Amino acid sequence: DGPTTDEVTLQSTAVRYP
Amino acid sequence: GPTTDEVTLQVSTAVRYPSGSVAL
Amino acid sequence: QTLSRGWGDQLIWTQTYEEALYKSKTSNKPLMIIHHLDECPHSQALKKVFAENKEIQKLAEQFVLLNLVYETTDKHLSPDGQYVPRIMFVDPSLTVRADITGRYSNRLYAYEPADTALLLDNMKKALKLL
Amino acid sequence: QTLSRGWGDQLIWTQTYEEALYKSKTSNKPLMIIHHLDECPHSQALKKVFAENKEIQKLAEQFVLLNLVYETTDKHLSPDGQYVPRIMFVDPSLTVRADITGRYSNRLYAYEPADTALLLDNMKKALKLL
Ligand SMILES: [Mg+2]
Structure with missing residues (x-):
C-alpha cells in the first residue's frame, strides 16, 4: 500500500489508528 | 524511633520486604 | 550526558516518558518522541538534518520533547514494531497519534x-489537537 | 540539561527507569534510584552532601545510577508513599529492595x-545480591 524503506535498525495512553 | 519531616510530598519488578514477626 | 543527544541543543528536552505525558496533558502541548540508537547510521543521518533544519527546530518549541535510546513500556508507541529512527506523536489527551504516519508502508513511523x-x-498535524 | 542534575557530574547516570532495569540485569550491578525535586530544599541539602561525599561517590560506581524529578509507574518504588528525597535500591534480579530502609519509621526511604x-x-547491603 505504498513505498517501503530499509533505512531502519531493528531493536495508560489511548491510541488513535489511521 | 525517629521520624522525619525533611521531605516534600509528591502531589516487571518484584519486591522484597523484611521477614515477618508477631506484633507487640 | 545531555538530554539533547545531538537532536537540538537549544531545545528543552524531557527526561522520561512519564514526565513527558504529564507535561503534555498539563500544558496542552503535543508530545514528540524520537526513538534512535547511537550505533544506527540511519539514526545519525536523520539526526543531522533534524538538528540543522531551522523550521523543525523552531516548530519543535510548540511541543513537549522526548528522545530515547531505549524503548518505553508503552506498546502504543510501537504499533508496527520497535525500530529506529521512529518519530511518534502523542496528543495532550494522552492519545498516541498512530494516525500520524510517515512515507513508508512497511515502517509507518x-x-x-x-x-x-x-x-x-x-x-x-500533531498541533491540530484531537 | 544533564542527567547528573548535581548528584555527581563524574558518575554515569541512566536516562530512564526501563533502561536502568535492563542495565542492572545485564551488568549484574544493583540500581540506586534517587527521587528529588528542584524546588525541594531537603532534596538540595541531601544532594550537596551526596555530591561531596568521597566514599559515596566512589562506591556509587558499583551501581547503575538513576535520579528522577518525576515518579516512575512502578508502585514497588513507593512502598510507603511518594515523597522526596527518597532513595530506593533494586536488585539485578529486578527485585526492589523494600527491605533496605533508612532511619525513619514514617518515611522509610x-x-x-x-x-x-x-x-x-x-x-x-544492596551489593549483597539476592
Ligand atoms: Mg520542609
Whole structure:
C-alpha cells in the first residue's frame, strides 16, 4: 500500500489508528 | 524511633520486604 | 550526558516518558518522541538534518520533547514494531497519534533524511489537537 | 540539561527507569534510584552532601545510577508513599529492595544530610545480591 524503506535498525495512553 | 519531616510530598519488578514477626 | 543527544541543543528536552505525558496533558502541548540508537547510521543521518533544519527546530518549541535510546513500556508507541529512527506523536489527551504516519508502508513511523517536509507536515498535524 | 542534575557530574547516570532495569540485569550491578525535586530544599541539602561525599561517590560506581524529578509507574518504588528525597535500591534480579530502609519509621526511604553513614551501609547491603 505504498513505498517501503530499509533505512531502519531493528531493536495508560489511548491510541488513535489511521 | 525517629521520624522525619525533611521531605516534600509528591502531589516487571518484584519486591522484597523484611521477614515477618508477631506484633507487640 | 545531555538530554539533547545531538537532536537540538537549544531545545528543552524531557527526561522520561512519564514526565513527558504529564507535561503534555498539563500544558496542552503535543508530545514528540524520537526513538534512535547511537550505533544506527540511519539514526545519525536523520539526526543531522533534524538538528540543522531551522523550521523543525523552531516548530519543535510548540511541543513537549522526548528522545530515547531505549524503548518505553508503552506498546502504543510501537504499533508496527520497535525500530529506529521512529518519530511518534502523542496528543495532550494522552492519545498516541498512530494516525500520524510517515512515507513508508512497511515502517509507518520511520523518516529518512529527505523526508523533512513530510515531518514538518506531521508536526503540524500533531498541533491540530484531537 | 544533564542527567547528573548535581548528584555527581563524574558518575554515569541512566536516562530512564526501563533502561536502568535492563542495565542492572545485564551488568549484574544493583540500581540506586534517587527521587528529588528542584524546588525541594531537603532534596538540595541531601544532594550537596551526596555530591561531596568521597566514599559515596566512589562506591556509587558499583551501581547503575538513576535520579528522577518525576515518579516512575512502578508502585514497588513507593512502598510507603511518594515523597522526596527518597532513595530506593533494586536488585539485578529486578527485585526492589523494600527491605533496605533508612532511619525513619514514617518515611522509610528518606535520608537526611546526617545519614550518609547509613546510606553507605545500605549501598553495601544492596551489593549483597539476592
Ligand atoms: Mg520542609
